[PDB]
């Protein structure tokens, strides 16, 4: 009886929290179209079908969104995969030349400042002795004046020469399924009203997570994963100021974004084998890129997010949405990609309201840049080559990223302003359900049995 | 038969169940413990780590009383200072995740105890078969 003995058990379920390098999986539909059409078509494995969502009883797991793993790992993965998808494309060091620019053939009005310049310059041929006088169109956000006469140069020539993305590759997101390696498990919190920190009373283990589209949007995160019943706000500490408030709502608001010119690309041969895709002529009228959001649906979703946000600040508070406060152009404005073209769409038409305690559309304008500086590194660009035809993309805004104002002085109202900041706040809105655990076998328990000789 | 499904003993499938109930299904945790450009490299950097740590814990069973028996009657008396709680409330109430936190402080003397007990009974068995 009291002669109880140690018995080991190998292969018994207990886990600890851990960090490890995770592992891709892509769907077979992305394998149906081949030949590096988009990135990570060879760097990741084909998935298995019917992933085993296995429920567990009587389990209270402590999840944490903000000190989570799998997001700095995902961020390093996506920036390294960005870097590897530019090495075979060309380098544009022979283009930092003194450009002679002028205005485009257009009725120039003095109030409207033209976003296009017509720039002509010398460039080497594939024959090294000869040079050709070519012309192209650039955006005013890419050239800068050198000081009568007018001479321009590119914006990045005194910082870094940089790479045109070779346009056989594309930039639309394909879903990536992260998978745990052997000897690790992935837990998913199947609770509904789960704000993102603390115990989750209904967990389930998954071998490989669902489709995560990596989108790069700063505010107004697009193509995301919706909620279940409510609109959910979440924060690390809501009484803090420096931490963004992630908002994810249930029914999406669709957004139609376009640029209505048709660029005609032309190939300017730099040297042997290296070509440079410039903008030729604009046939038809020149117009401004824009985006449309349904007004009634936007007002309804802002009503829902005010009804949700009053639960954390008292019901008798006046919530006021203002536009962005300032900073660089990739955070003051809604930045995204659309069919391989980078839009920067103004956002003051949406975030402008005041809510008290009791078929039209919003058109918001955009400006597009050809030279990006994504992830803000020291010696990088990407010269996005132009796309032929008009460009239209329809997507579905699912979430928002907000920021309070750090109010003193007897303030009865709370002003909310959008703000992009980091890019990890995007994927942090998609990996909130998931924790990675190291399963460890080999438990030790006493029982009533003794080893013989 | 139609209109009916089939469930099969899933991975981690009894993590909230009782220790007496989880003590019958250990083999699925053992089966899904081994099997399942630099990116291949880094998942290679994952993969061998898996197999490395797998062999590591089996090496521990190589030193104690049982190489592959997957449960193991031993000959170390259970000190009541570790648990001081009777069997019928351990095997019929608690789950394993609670027990691991409960005796996670009391480890690393059990491992040396088991090692010494196995080596001691091994050399005694060698001396027993020696005199024949």
């Amino acid at each position, epitope marked *: 009886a009291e002669n109880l003995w140690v018995t080991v058990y190998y292969g018994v379920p207990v886990w600890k929290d851990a960090e490890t390098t995770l592992f891709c999986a892509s769907d077979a539909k992305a394998y149906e179209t081949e030949k590096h059409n988009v990135w990570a078509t060879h760097a990741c494995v084909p998935t298995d079908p*019917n992933p*085993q969502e296995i429920h567990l009883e009587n389990v209270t797991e402590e999840f944490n969104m903000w000190k989570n793993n799998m997001v700095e790992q995902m961020h390093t993965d996506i920036i390294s995969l960005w870097d590897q998808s530019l090495k075979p494309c060309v380098k544009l060091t022979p283009l930092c030349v003194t450009l002679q620019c002028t205005n485009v053939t257009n009725n120039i009005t003095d109030d409207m400042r033209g976003e296009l310049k017509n720039c002509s310059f010398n460039m080497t041929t594939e024959l090294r002795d000869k040079k050709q006088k070519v012309y192209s169109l650039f955006y005013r956000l890419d050239v800068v004046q050198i000081n009568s006469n007018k001479e321009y140069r590119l914006i990045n020539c005194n910082t870094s020469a940089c790479t045109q993305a070779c346009p056989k590759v594309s930039f639309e997101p394909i879903p990536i399924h992260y998978c745990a390696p052997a000897g690790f498990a992935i837990l998913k919190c199947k609770d509904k009203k789960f704000n993102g920190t603390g115990p989750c009373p209904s967990v389930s283990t998954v071998q490989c997570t669902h489709g995560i589209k990596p989108v790069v949007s700063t505010q107004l995160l697009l193509n995301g994963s919706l909620a279940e019943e409510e609109v959910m706000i979440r924060s690390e500490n809501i009484t803090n100021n420096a931490k963004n408030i992630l908002v994810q709502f249930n029914t999406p608001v669709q957004i139609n974004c376009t640029r209505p010119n048709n660029n005609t690309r032309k190939s300017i041969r730099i040297g042997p084998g290296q070509a440079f895709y410039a903008t030729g002529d604009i046939i038809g009228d020149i117009r401004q890129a824009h985006c449309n959001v349904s007004k009634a649906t936007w007002n309804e979703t802002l009503g829902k997010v005010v009804k949700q946000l009053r639960k954390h600040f008292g019901n008798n508070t006046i919530i006021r949405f203002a536009n962005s406060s300032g900073g660089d152009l990739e955070v003051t404005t809604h930045s995204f990609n659309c069919g391989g073209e980078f839009f920067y769409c103004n956002t003051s038409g949406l975030f402008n309201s005041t809510w008290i305690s009791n078929n039209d559309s919003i058109t918001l304008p955009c400006r597009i840049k050809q030279i990006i500086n994504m992830w803000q590194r020291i010696g990088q660009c990407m010269y996005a080559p132009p796309i032929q035809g008009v460009i239209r993309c329809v997507s579905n805004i699912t979430g928002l990223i907000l920021t309070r104002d750090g109010g003193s002085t007897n303030s009865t109202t709370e002003t909310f302003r959008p703000g992009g900041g980091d890019m990890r706040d995007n994927w942090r809105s998609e990996l909130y359900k998931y924790k990675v655990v190291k399963i460890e076998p080999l438990g030790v328990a006493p029982t009533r049995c003794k080893r013989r000789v | *038969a*139609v209109g009916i*499904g*089939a*469930v*099969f*003993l*899933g991975f981690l499938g009894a993590a909230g169940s009782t220790m007496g109930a989880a003590s019958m299904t250990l083999t699925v945790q053992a089966r899904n413990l081994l099997s399942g450009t630099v990116w291949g490299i880094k998942q290679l950097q994952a993969r061998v780590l898996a197999v490395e740590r797998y062999l590591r814990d089996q090496q521990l069973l190589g030193i104690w009383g049982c190489s592959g028996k997957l449960i193991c009657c031993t000959n170390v008396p259970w000190n009541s200072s570790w648990s001081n709680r009777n069997l019928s409330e351990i095997w019929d109430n608690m789950t394993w995740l609670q027990w691991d936190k409960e005796i996670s402080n009391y480890t690393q003397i059990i491992y040396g105890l088991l090692e010494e007990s196995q080596n001691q009974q091994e050399k005694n068995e060698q001396d027993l078969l020696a005199l024949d």
Partner: antibody
Amino acid sequence: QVQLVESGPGVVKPSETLSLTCVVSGGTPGRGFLYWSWVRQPPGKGLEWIGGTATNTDITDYNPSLKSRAAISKDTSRNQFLLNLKPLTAGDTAVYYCTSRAKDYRGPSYSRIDVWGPGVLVTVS
Amino acid sequence: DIVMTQTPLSLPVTPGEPASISCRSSQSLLDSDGNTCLDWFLQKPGQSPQLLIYDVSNRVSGVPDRFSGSGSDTDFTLKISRVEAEDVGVYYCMQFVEFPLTFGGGTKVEIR
């Protein structure tokens, strides 16, 4: 299989559409699949199985007596599955059940998992 | 479809006497695997059905041995050795050898 939740309109006039949703809390506790069904019971009459589907496939089985008026679908990401019925007659007044069934091999002996939701009575008038 | 007939449709029973309920199918219930696919449920008034008897003679756990099931390929009998107050309700046989699943018409044990 820990929980099944039925939903749909509680009173419907004969020209509208009967739509029912069953939300599964705790899909499956092991490898394999479950079979999820809708079953109905008219007052003082027997149980009648309307239809169902396996979690492992996208093919649904329907009772031929129902004249191909029923359409059943699913989506596991929302852990839901649905039954739609159009046209209606007073004979479709019934208590409606969602059910989940599987053979259970997790114990020392072969047993069954067999769970039913509480059901919702629907009277058409 | 296989037509399932349960007899009788309405049988009120006084507490304590034994009962036997018959069920018949238009086809054999022996399937490929050798299993006879017939379950018995009881639906007490204002409650959900609860599985009572499954393959040939086996009772679900927690159900007392007072309930017993027997049968051939097409003819089945549920016997209750001693009737108690919570046995009242509608008893159902059900086939699952083939789609559609079909239930017997039910036997209502009620207090007159």
